[PDB]
Structure formats: C-alpha cells, structure tokens
C-alpha cells in the first residue's frame, strides 16, 4: 500500500484544511449571531418610530369623535 | 508509531468533521429560528408605519401625485 509518508502528508494537509474550516465556521456562527443582534436593534428602532407615528391616527380619531 | 500516526490522523479528521457538522447546524438553527421571524416583525412594523401615514399619502397624492 501507498508509501506511509505520502498517506501521512495527505492526512496532515486534510488536518490543516479542516482546522481552517473549523475556526472559520466558528467565525461564521459568531458573525450570524451578531448580524441577528443588529437586525434586532434595527427592528427595535423601527418599533420606536412606529410608536411615535401611532399618534397620528389617534389625532384623526379625536377629530372625528369631536366632530 | 509509524502506523499509529495514520490512525491518529483518522481520529482527528472524524472529530473535526463532527465539529463542522455541529457548527453548520448551529448556523442553520440561528438563521431559521431568529433572523426570519425578526424580518417578519420588521415588515409588520413597516406596514404599521405605512398605515399610520395613509392620510398624508392621500393629502399629497390627491393634488400633487
């Protein structure tokens, strides 16, 4: 069977490739979590803007009732 | 020891592959269960803002498009 050094070298290169894959996938995980947090922040800002804009229909209802 | 290295590297490949599988599954769960519902909530909030501003839309569109 194939020269031991060749097999072992192939397995080391697979090791190092998979090690970059592991560290990179951890980075991908943390990146996705941080992106989710950013989307949460932006959605909360939108919620605050919607709450502020909600006064307009209240004003319209008040005018209609007082009519 | 010269044969044992092959077995050790095989074990390393196995554990590394398991780690990759776990990380990818975590990414999938994060996306599907967090980001999509958040986008839906953002869409609903934007629709609420649009609803509150309809009368401005009529006021402007009726006379100036």
């Amino acid at each position: 069977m194939d020269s031991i050094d060749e097999q072992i070298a192939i397995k080391r290169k697979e090791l190092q490739s998979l090690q970059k894959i592991t560290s990179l996938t951890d980075g991908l995980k943390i990146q996705l979590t941080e992106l989710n947090e950013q989307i949460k922040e932006m959605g909360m800002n939108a919620d605050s803007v919607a709450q502020l804009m909600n006064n307009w229909d209240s004003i319209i209802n008040n005018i209609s009732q007082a009519s | 020891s010269k044969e044992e290295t092959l077995e050790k590297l095989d074990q390393e490949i196995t554990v590394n592959l398991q780690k990759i599988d776990s990380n990818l599954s975590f990414c999938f769960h994060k996306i599907t269960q967090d980001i999509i519902p958040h986008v839906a909530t953002y869409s609903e909030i934007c629709e609420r803002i649009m609803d509150s501003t309809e009368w401005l839309g009529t006021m402007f569109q009726e006379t100036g498009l």
């Binding site: 005018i63 209609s64 | 009368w55 009529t58």
Partner: peptide, 26 residues
C-alpha cells in the same frame, strides 16, 4: 391596495343619529 377616502375626517353621522333621535323622542 384600495384607495383612501377623499374626506379623511368622516363624521359618524349614522350611529349618533340612530340613537340620538330616539333619545330626543324619549
């Protein structure tokens, strides 16, 4: 997608009338 009402401030004429006229009768 339907358009809004050209008079924005709609007077609730009907609901007020249907009960206030009976109140005036009473």
């Amino acid at each position: 997608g339907r358009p809004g009402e050209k008079p924005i401030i709609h007077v609730p004429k009907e609901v007020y009338l249907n009960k206030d006229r009976l109140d005036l009768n009473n």
